[PDB]
Amino acid sequence: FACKTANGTAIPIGGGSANVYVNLAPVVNVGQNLVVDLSTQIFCHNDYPETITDYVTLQRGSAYGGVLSNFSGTVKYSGSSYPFPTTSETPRVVYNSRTDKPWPVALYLTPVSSAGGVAIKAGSLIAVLILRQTNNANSDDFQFVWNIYANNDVVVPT
Ligand SMILES: O=C(O)CN(CCN(CC(=O)O)CC(=O)O)CC(=O)O
């Protein structure tokens, strides 16, 4: 089991970490959601699908910088919604193919009442998402750590 980002950075068997640089909507009004869809940026595959089933969770998601200060969050994982920053590990998603498939994570971020101006600075760390990978054969328990960085400013107009 291994993962890759949309620009080709890999995390190999056994886990590791990588940076993910994401374009964000440059403006988000009070009452609207800023969507950070990681499913178009993070992909994973099972190397030996005839031999083993791999299981994948969002073990935890943390917010940083302007996301932590200026937004109220939820994370959708494989169709279900949870608080973001997270308070529990999600259910497991099955990976059963050598073809890379999306990691089905999206953040829904709406401005807090105090947000105004540049609410996320371009280049800043906005999130760390920990993917936990297990399997149905042995006790392997691997962490794939995704450090999410903003490519551009996000403005909340005032
Ligand atoms: O997980 C696999 O793909 C192969 N499994 C078999 C698990 N299968 C049972 C079966 O194929 O009859 C679970 C499944 O139904 O996918 C071997 C193992 O026990 O580690």
Domains and CATH numbers, the chain: 1-158 (2.60.40.1090)
Using the mean position of ligand 1's atoms as its centre, give its distance from the Cα of residue 94 in Å: 12
CA distance 68 to 156: 14
DSSP code at position 67: H
Which residue, chain included where needed, has tokens 């193919």?
Answer: 97
Residue 137, exposed/middle/buried by CB under 10 A (0-12, 13-18, 19+)?
exposed
Q: Whose CA is nearest to atom 14 of ligand 1?
A: 53
Locate the DSSP E strands across 26-139: 34-37, 42-45, 54-63, 71-77, 80-84, 93-95, 101-102, 105-111, 117-120, 125-135
Which residue, chain included where needed, has tokens 């709406």?
Answer: 110
CA distance 91 to 42: 18
E strand or H helix that includes residue 29:
none
Using the mean position of ligand 1's atoms as its centre, give its distance from the Cα of residue 35 in Å: 36
Pocket of ligand 1, candidates 47, 50, 52: which has the most ligand atoms within 8 Å of its Cβ, to mutate?
52
Q: Is 52 in the pocket of ligand 1 (CB under 6 A)?
A: yes
47 has binding-site annotation: yes
Burial 40-53, CB ≥16 within 10 A → b, else e: ebbbbbbeebeebe
Contact present, 52 and 135 (Cβ < 8 Å)? yes
Of ligand 1's listed atoms, the one at least distance from the Cα of 49 is 3
CA distance 96 to 43: 13
Q: Is 53 in the pocket of ligand 1 (CB under 6 A)?
A: yes
CA distance 129 to 89: 11
Contact present, 134 and 143 (Cβ < 8 Å)? no
Q: Whose CA is nearest to atom 3 of ligand 1?
A: 52
